[PDB]
Design a protein around this ligand. Structure first.
Ligand code: IAC
Length: 412
């Protein structure tokens, strides 16, 4: 894969469905805090990808001096022993199970907005089967070169949301109460945390390059483009509708029904189904290996049954993003990538003999360790501590409001 091919991957593996939920998040944070968090986590999310990049280079160089595919649960094994391999494997697979569920919930939610004759829960049955057929495909890693399409699908939707909101225009009923409560505020901040970071598949992309060393720069440019997709779409939609978004998690529910809006759903539905096969093809690999194992394709289904159940019992499109973000992404994409870097380079011989030197601008090892400590401290307290509690108390509130196995979420 070429260097530019990866940039299409880091930009398509980024916001897929959360792009629709970001406007809902700002209604809980306010426009000011909303912009700052995306920039704040955008840089931290881009910084942790660098941490995953130096770790991968260190692993391969050590292993080459003493191969077809590498993954995160194996890089930790080589550097920090098998104890971290189990730690990384569980958190990644748990994030893929729920991360894959979010796609199924999003697909069912989006389709409802072009054909409302069937309720959203029923659409989870139809799309659940259309997402359970992923077991009948050997793998999607071989088709990671078509990521340029995913960027186009996300690019059009982001530019529609901002342009459509601006043309729609706000009205007298529109109000912007900003951070009304801490439960809502931290729930929104967790959606932005869930948005950025790398999504745990940042180590597989690097192995496809002719020169994996320069990935750290590519991701930063890939995150800068994402901010161009999220900052104007989320800021504009919030401006047009304001607090009305609080009861409308999906931005497409508020924008007027139009042929252009239909395109947003159709293009976005494809991008989420493919993103569903990208967040489940690793699950079908670990799962089959664990059980030892068309004789194989059908056997993958057991993994899908949890995806159906979670997607149907908790169709909470908006709040689920925060529930996954605070408990799993905060420990899978921010804290573990940061702890591993600190542990591996803790010994003096490893640090001095590091394959790649630390950045001069950051300030050498002293700067890198200080930043890594901040990442762990900030995400652990705000990302997991406050974010987890606020997300959970907001998540359970959905159960009271809409009930278990709700027929339809946040629809008229
Ligand atoms: O970032 C998101 O909205 C979710 C997402 C996009 N690509 C993914 C790959 C694996 C797991 C989750 C995601």
């Amino acid at each position: 894969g070429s260097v530019y091919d990866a940039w299409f991957s880091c930009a398509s593996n980024q916001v897929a469905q959360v792009l629709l939920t970001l406007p809902y998040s700002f209604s809980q944070l306010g426009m000011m805090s909303g912009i700052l968090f995306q920039l704040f986590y955008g840089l931290m999310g881009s910084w942790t990808a660098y941490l995953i990049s130096v770790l991968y280079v260190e692993y391969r160089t050590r292993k080459e001096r003493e191969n077809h595919v590498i993954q995160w649960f194996e890089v930790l094994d080589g550097l920090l022993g098998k104890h971290w391999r189990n730690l990384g494997l569980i958190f990644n697979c748990t994030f893929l199970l729920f991360g894959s569920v979010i796609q199924l919930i999003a697909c069912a939610s989006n389709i409802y907005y072009i054909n409302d004759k069937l309720d959203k829960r029923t659409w989870t049955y139809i799309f659940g089967a259309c997402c359970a057929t992923t077991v009948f495909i050997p793998s999607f890693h071989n088709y990671r070169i078509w990521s340029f399409l995913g960027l186009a699908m996300t690019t059009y939707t982001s530019w529609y949301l901002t342009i459509a909101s601006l043309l729609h225009g706000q009205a007298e009923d529109v109000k912007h109460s900003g951070p009304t409560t801490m439960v809502l505020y931290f729930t929104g901040a967790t959606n932005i945390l869930y948005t950025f970071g790398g999504h745990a598949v940042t180590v597989e992309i690097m192995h496809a390059m002719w020169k994996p060393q320069k990935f750290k720069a590519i991701y930063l440019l890939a995150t800068i483009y994402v901010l161009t997709l999220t900052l104007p779409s989320a800021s504009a939609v919030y401006w047009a509708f304001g607090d009305k978004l609080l009861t409308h998690s999906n931005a497409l529910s508020l924008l007027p029904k139009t042929g252009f809006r239909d395109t947003a759903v159709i293009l976005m539905l494809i991008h989420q189904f493919i993103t569903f096969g990208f967040a489940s093809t690793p699950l079908y690999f670990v799962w089959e290996k664990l059980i030892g194992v068309f004789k194989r394709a059908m056997a993958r289904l057991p993994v899908v049954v949890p995806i159906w159940f979670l997607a149907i019992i908790f169709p909470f499109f908006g709040p689920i993003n925060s529930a996954v973000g605070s408990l799993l992404v905060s420990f899978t994409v921010y804290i573990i990538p940061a702890l591993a870097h600190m542990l591996t380079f803790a010994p003096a011989p490893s640090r001095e003999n590091a394959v790649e030197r630390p950045p001069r601008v950051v300030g050498g090892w002293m700067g890198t360790y200080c930043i890594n400590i901040f990442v762990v401290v900030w995400v652990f307290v705000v990302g997991f501590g406050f974010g987890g509690w606020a997300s959970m108390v907001n998540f359970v509130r959905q159960i009271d409001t809409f009930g278990l196995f709700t027929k339809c979420y946040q629809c008229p």
